[PDB]
Design an enzyme around this catalytic site. Sequence first.
Site, PDB file in Angstrom:
ATOM      1  CG  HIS A   1     -94.717 -17.335 -80.667  1.00  9.92           C
ATOM      2  ND1 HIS A   1     -94.554 -15.976 -80.698  1.00  9.92           N
ATOM      3  CD2 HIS A   1     -93.783 -17.826 -81.490  1.00  9.92           C
ATOM      4  CE1 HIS A   1     -93.435 -15.672 -81.363  1.00  9.92           C
ATOM      5  NE2 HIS A   1     -92.929 -16.794 -81.849  1.00  9.92           N
TER       6      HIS A   1
ATOM      7  CG  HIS B   1     -87.268 -20.097 -89.150  1.00 17.93           C
ATOM      8  ND1 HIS B   1     -86.285 -19.410 -88.492  1.00 17.93           N
ATOM      9  CD2 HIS B   1     -88.415 -19.881 -88.439  1.00 17.93           C
ATOM     10  CE1 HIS B   1     -86.822 -18.790 -87.444  1.00 17.93           C
ATOM     11  NE2 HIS B   1     -88.126 -19.045 -87.358  1.00 17.93           N
TER      12      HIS B   1
HETATM   13  C1  HEM Z   1     -84.119 -19.220 -82.084  1.00 16.68           C
HETATM   14  C2  HEM Z   1     -85.428 -19.553 -82.213  1.00 16.68           C
HETATM   15  C3  HEM Z   1     -86.296 -18.722 -83.064  1.00 16.68           C
HETATM   16  C4  HEM Z   1     -86.235 -17.405 -83.351  1.00 16.68           C
HETATM   17  C5  HEM Z   1     -85.241 -16.372 -82.759  1.00 16.68           C
HETATM   18  C6  HEM Z   1     -87.328 -17.119 -84.249  1.00 16.68           C
HETATM   19  C7  HEM Z   1     -87.701 -15.833 -84.777  1.00 16.68           C
HETATM   20  C8  HEM Z   1     -88.744 -15.629 -85.598  1.00 16.68           C
HETATM   21  C9  HEM Z   1     -89.207 -14.324 -85.989  1.00 16.68           C
HETATM   22  C10 HEM Z   1     -88.456 -13.097 -85.601  1.00 16.68           C
HETATM   23  C11 HEM Z   1     -90.246 -14.501 -86.880  1.00 16.68           C
HETATM   24  C12 HEM Z   1     -90.936 -13.298 -87.592  1.00 16.68           C
HETATM   25  C13 HEM Z   1     -92.121 -12.855 -86.878  1.00 16.68           C
HETATM   26  C14 HEM Z   1     -92.858 -11.906 -87.871  1.00 16.68           C
HETATM   27  O1  HEM Z   1     -92.147 -10.893 -88.089  1.00 16.68           O
HETATM   28  O2  HEM Z   1     -93.901 -12.211 -88.440  1.00 16.68           O
HETATM   29  C15 HEM Z   1     -90.510 -15.880 -86.949  1.00 16.68           C
HETATM   30  C16 HEM Z   1     -91.434 -16.497 -87.760  1.00 16.68           C
HETATM   31  C17 HEM Z   1     -91.693 -17.803 -87.703  1.00 16.68           C
HETATM   32  N1  HEM Z   1     -91.022 -18.849 -87.005  1.00 16.68           N
HETATM   33 FE1  HEM Z   1     -89.512 -18.564 -85.851  1.00 16.68          FE
HETATM   34  N2  HEM Z   1     -87.984 -18.243 -84.557  1.00 16.68           N
HETATM   35  C18 HEM Z   1     -87.469 -19.215 -83.767  1.00 16.68           C
HETATM   36  C19 HEM Z   1     -87.845 -20.477 -83.707  1.00 16.68           C
HETATM   37  C20 HEM Z   1     -88.982 -21.033 -84.323  1.00 16.68           C
HETATM   38  C21 HEM Z   1     -89.435 -22.400 -84.096  1.00 16.68           C
HETATM   39  C22 HEM Z   1     -88.981 -23.401 -83.030  1.00 16.68           C
HETATM   40  C23 HEM Z   1     -90.540 -22.596 -84.919  1.00 16.68           C
HETATM   41  C24 HEM Z   1     -91.421 -23.705 -85.105  1.00 16.68           C
HETATM   42  C25 HEM Z   1     -91.087 -24.975 -84.967  1.00 16.68           C
HETATM   43  C26 HEM Z   1     -90.655 -21.325 -85.643  1.00 16.68           C
HETATM   44  C27 HEM Z   1     -91.529 -21.250 -86.680  1.00 16.68           C
HETATM   45  C28 HEM Z   1     -91.836 -19.906 -87.221  1.00 16.68           C
HETATM   46  C29 HEM Z   1     -92.623 -19.783 -88.390  1.00 16.68           C
HETATM   47  C30 HEM Z   1     -93.514 -20.773 -89.088  1.00 16.68           C
HETATM   48  C31 HEM Z   1     -92.593 -18.413 -88.655  1.00 16.68           C
HETATM   49  C32 HEM Z   1     -93.337 -17.755 -89.776  1.00 16.68           C
HETATM   50  C33 HEM Z   1     -94.518 -16.864 -89.508  1.00 16.68           C
HETATM   51  C34 HEM Z   1     -95.411 -16.471 -90.678  1.00 16.68           C
HETATM   52  O3  HEM Z   1     -95.288 -17.036 -91.804  1.00 16.68           O
HETATM   53  O4  HEM Z   1     -96.257 -15.535 -90.444  1.00 16.68           O
HETATM   54  N3  HEM Z   1     -89.552 -20.503 -85.395  1.00 16.68           N
HETATM   55  N4  HEM Z   1     -89.610 -16.542 -86.230  1.00 16.68           N
END
Ligand code: HEM
Lengths: 713, 713
Positions: free
Chosen positions: B77, B244
């Site tokens: 982010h 993810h």
């Molecule tokens: C279309 C693009 C993306 C969407 C719509 C998206 C959406 C989300 C959302 C909704 C969460 C949950 C937030 C929460 O409820 O804790 C999340 C978690 C996360 N995303 Fe994405 N994401 C996107 C791209 C990315 C990218 C580019 C990365 C990294 C390279 C990323 C890595 C993370 C990781 C590691 C989590 C996990 C958080 C945790 O374990 O607390 N995502 N993402």
Amino acid sequence: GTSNRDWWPNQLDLSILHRHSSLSDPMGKDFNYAQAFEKLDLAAVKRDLHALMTTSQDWWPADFGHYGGLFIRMAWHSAGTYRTADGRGGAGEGQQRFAPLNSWPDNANLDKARRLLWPIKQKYGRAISWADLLILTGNVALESMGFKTFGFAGGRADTWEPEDVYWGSEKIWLELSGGPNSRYSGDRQLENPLAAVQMGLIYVNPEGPDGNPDPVAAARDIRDTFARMAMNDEETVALIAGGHTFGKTHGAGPDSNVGAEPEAAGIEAQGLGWKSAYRTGKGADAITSGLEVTWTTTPTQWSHNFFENLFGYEWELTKSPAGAHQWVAKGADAVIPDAFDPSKKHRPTMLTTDLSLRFDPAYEKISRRFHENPEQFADAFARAWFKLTHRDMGPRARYLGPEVPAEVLLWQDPIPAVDHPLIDAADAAELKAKVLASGLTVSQLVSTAWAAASTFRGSDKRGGANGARIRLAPQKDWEANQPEQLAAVLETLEAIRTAFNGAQRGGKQVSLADLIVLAGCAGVEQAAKNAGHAVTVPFAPGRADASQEQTDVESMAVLEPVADGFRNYLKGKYRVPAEVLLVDKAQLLTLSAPEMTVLLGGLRVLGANVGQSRHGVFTAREQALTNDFFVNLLDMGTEWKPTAADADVFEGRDRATGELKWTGTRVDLVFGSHSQLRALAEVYGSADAQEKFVRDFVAVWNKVMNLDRFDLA
Amino acid sequence: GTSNRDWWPNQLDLSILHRHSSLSDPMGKDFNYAQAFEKLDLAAVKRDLHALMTTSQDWWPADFGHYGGLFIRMAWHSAGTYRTADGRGGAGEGQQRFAPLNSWPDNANLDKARRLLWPIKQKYGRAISWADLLILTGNVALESMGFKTFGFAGGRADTWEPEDVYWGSEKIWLELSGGPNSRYSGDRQLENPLAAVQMGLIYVNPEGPDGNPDPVAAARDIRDTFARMAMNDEETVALIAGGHTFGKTHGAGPDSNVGAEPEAAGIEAQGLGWKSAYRTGKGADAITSGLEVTWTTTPTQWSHNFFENLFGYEWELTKSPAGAHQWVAKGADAVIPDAFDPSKKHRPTMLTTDLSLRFDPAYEKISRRFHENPEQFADAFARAWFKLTHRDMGPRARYLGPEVPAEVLLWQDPIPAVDHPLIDAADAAELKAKVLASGLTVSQLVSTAWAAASTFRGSDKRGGANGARIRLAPQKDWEANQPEQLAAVLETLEAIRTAFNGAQRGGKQVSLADLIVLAGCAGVEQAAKNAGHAVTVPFAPGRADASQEQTDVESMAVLEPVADGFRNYLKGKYRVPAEVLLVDKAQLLTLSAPEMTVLLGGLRVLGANVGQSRHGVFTAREQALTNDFFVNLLDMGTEWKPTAADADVFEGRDRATGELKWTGTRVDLVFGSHSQLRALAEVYGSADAQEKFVRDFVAVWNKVMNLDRFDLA
Ligand code: HEM
Ligand code: HEM
Ligand SMILES: [Cl-]
Ligand SMILES: [Cl-]
Ligand code: NA
Ligand code: NA
């Protein structure tokens, strides 16, 4: 574009503390306006200004062939935004040429007056500030018309952006009282720190209170507003009668003919506004306030005709051509000249607020004495005009040029001249040692010097430790100053002073003002030593001790700190959150956010709090100069909750155990909440920061000690 | 308290140009973050970060015992606010810790992540910035969990207040499209310069477009937003599937349990927000987005399981416990571990936007290839994660520390090394003489060097004269750059360069990049000579010439100036007033208001306007370096009116005669209207200011010529 102010409209605003950066300033970092002004040929500027008075420009033709009235008006509005409550406003920064003042309705057509001045500002360039020029122009207008002024000082440096001033909460220009953001409450009580009756006015409504044309009730508003600009009855009568000796008002046609104020006008208007569709838009057809009054038979010459008319006729209510209420002497002959047609004459006219000078009984006595004794009127007006236009200039040491009046006035909070050799560095070291050997504590020393120095405000450059007025009425009895503790400290310091002065030869002596400051320096040095650091706090002698007789007690009242977050002090309960009051105090002390932050965290652990409160004393080594405030404030092992007793006091408990570790106020905890302040606190709370904290603390401490030291400028 | 913004909401705002002053900065004026970081023990910081990963705090317990997922999200982010349109946003200033980004809904609970990092920030102090630390922590999370990163560069200095960024006009967080301030129009066309679909989101809505759970339509939004963040299809699939692979989302209960975001929270929350009333409010009960998805069987370990699940199951639409749309694997066993209870398992789940990677045809091909060739997936995600987190860092010369990747990437707009002696002062004099002897005019020399250097923007540190990209596609063909005139100047300069380089001994040669800038210098020198002034302009050699193959033509497009007030150039008609665009370009160029003012007034008289337009050329001595622009603009003898043909062009006529003296645009005339700008124009238009104007102009000129010169930092 949605902004942080839109999403979080009540977050604290720190950008007031970072106005006036080197970024916005077109002058070099070493530019010194006093040096430039001191070489200005002032006599030559005044000759240019003399000539201008009767050199009419077709785009804003001079009434009677003479701009003098317009320019007196200009200079009185420049000075007339001043408020004694916070020292903000006044002529001292030339703020009339920036928003919002350049577009206040009471400043209509002063944009024309400022424009007439451009060729002269241009000719002399950085040697005369706009701020100086507005006032000098008013003086020269008075002189050109036969009035002897009391003098003039230069030294108002120009500023380059709007100051941040609370002018009121109304969202409508000129809004009558009683609305949703009314600045009145109770029995016509105007809210502090305001000094005007409606938003966009200088003082009062010339038609009367909220437009009601009753001279008697208008007088009550005159008196209140003028008092809130530091003028008493005699000064107010002299100023209003004096100014309305000259010129005229403008209301040739309905107000709806006048267009957009300068900040709203089109780009082609090139900084001017209030363009009028009435007839030619200017000169004989001019519309400014919507009143159409000419006070005297000789609007371009000093006289005593304003009082001759005010007392010599009986007055009746009438309407100007724009429909505003004003007064005419119907029994009179047409003795008043027309501004452009030599074949027309008019009856005498007056504003409601002029008639106040005759129908308020206190004012009538003064008016009558000035009527019978016009030399007394001229002397009063000269003195009051000087005061009006210099009230926010600060100590006489800032006054520049060949026309400064030699007479020292009580309102200037005068400091006596120093006529003896000053202590040197070895002497300072010996006095610091004697102070520390006396038994006075770090807390006592720091608190007393803070109290003495932190009355300074940069808005009007009043206050500070010069004078040693801490020892006099009323400062000695202010609650923030801890009057019994302060008396004990001052007694001990006075004994030290007497001993030291008695042992000298050759006239060398130290003032009590200097010793109060030096002793606070010793306290900071000893605090650093308590923390295992040897530092020297800088100290500049040369302060002098003013007497009680040189100290106007009533005028000192507005300097009393009723909120001082630096000492965790709030005199009572305020509508405004304490953190807001902290930033306001910082702005008045000329501090940036970083300087505020370092200074508060150091004062906390030095024992500066009023009452020896533990609030914010986040250390187990009180009176040692450390960054404990920040390290403990930022420790996530501590959880904070507002108390049951008081929602503005907070308990910090160990998160695992529930044990009580600390208490704090909003002022303390804002440094852990506000995202910009917490970024600051982080710097000073980091492991690498002990040396930086101490140095930055000593630098800001010394800055505060020297705020009123324009003798060293 | 009513402010200027309230009374005059569309007046131009200059305070964007005086952000980031020495006043708001707690560090001393000489602090050099690069020098501090270079001495940091980076290996030690990384060991502390590895330890932190599995040191769970009770106030925000780590999912699966490991904060890696949370931290990768935090880093993604931090970098993910970036927009290629203006270069604003990104990780490079650590703006995540300030308003508004600290309180965007999409950054919910990242305040917890940041707070977990405070003990490490504190330990290392000024030697590691928050901005570097956020990124480093993401890298260490990846490494902890088994993924080898491509590298890391330090050098992101911290900032101390919010950046002024247009994030959209909506007044409601997360507002769906088509409202009164809609960021979409037409066939789902997102307004420039925005790169997110809803206010307070990073890129897209994880439920689908405006909440509608269609993976195919979601894909269109992913592709558009990610392209607005400089990522192509391969990089976007690698980043989303890579991210993810780790961790989980949080939606354990209804969103109505979650309270105020950090900027709205009470002071006792000490900088944190989103406090939840659902069950324990944290850990197993956490609520962040409202979705409850865990992607893989080993959320704390790099795997190939994302694509195995994506393709290995068929998906059914369902609702999280907060009511949000998400997907569950049809007929699957409970194979996904619970974050806290070892006795629970769950079926595989996906967001709508994860299913985009399978159901968008172009993405499916990529996703399949990565599923079949996981080593291609790993390498692409490493490369893309490095680009993500370094895209706004600027030239490689800025990259610090022991982990910087040696591989040069096309996206870095690479500049070749210099491997030969540089010209000296005698050589520079000789080349300036040959330039002036060639026939090239002041206007051509100034215009060309302006065109080459003024492509720089400080937002992402792209652009500038290094590289001599002005001679390549696409810069050589940009309309602003006057492509036919530019080609004639480049041809003449290239012949001068070839002659010079051919006569040298040893390997001494001058680059075309250097010569373009040196030739501009010469033009300014000649201009000053035309005005009778003796001026030397400073010049620093060392630029090199990039090749076409080192110059990605599509990524260069966003640097094209479609508005350049400095050249009186507007490519077409825009919603935003030209003066607003001027200030925006000044902010990109890192100029203050005074610098913007001096620079424009000089450029106008030197003949820098596109097309040789006379607009703003308020002088009778074109190509002579004087302050004529200011003196004539402020002459009250001239009256300005908008033309009949075009309301944004103005005619300046003699007030008395009606004769036509000048024409001007809004960019020109804003300097005579805006009350802060006019104050600045007045200093430069005064009779004592010719020398100051010249000196100030040469300083700002040289600043602009050196904006990209990080090899000399
Ligand atoms: C279309 C693009 C993306 C969407 C719509 C998206 C959406 C989300 C959302 C909704 C969460 C949950 C937030 C929460 O409820 O804790 C999340 C978690 C996360 N995303 Fe994405 N994401 C996107 C791209 C990315 C990218 C580019 C990365 C990294 C390279 C990323 C890595 C993370 C990781 C590691 C989590 C996990 C958080 C945790 O374990 O607390 N995502 N993402
Ligand atoms: C109760 C306080 C006062 C009231 C309500 C007030 C009211 C006004 C009004 C409405 C005008 C007409 C503006 C126009 O239409 O052009 C004006 C003019 C004037 N005022 Fe005052 N006045 C105040 C005090 C003062 C003071 C303290 C001074 C100076 C010492 C001053 C000097 C003048 C002058 C010289 C003009 C003439 C302007 C010209 O000739 O263009 N007034 N007054
Ligand atoms: Cl002010
Ligand atoms: Cl930004
Ligand atoms: Na003031
Ligand atoms: Na950026």
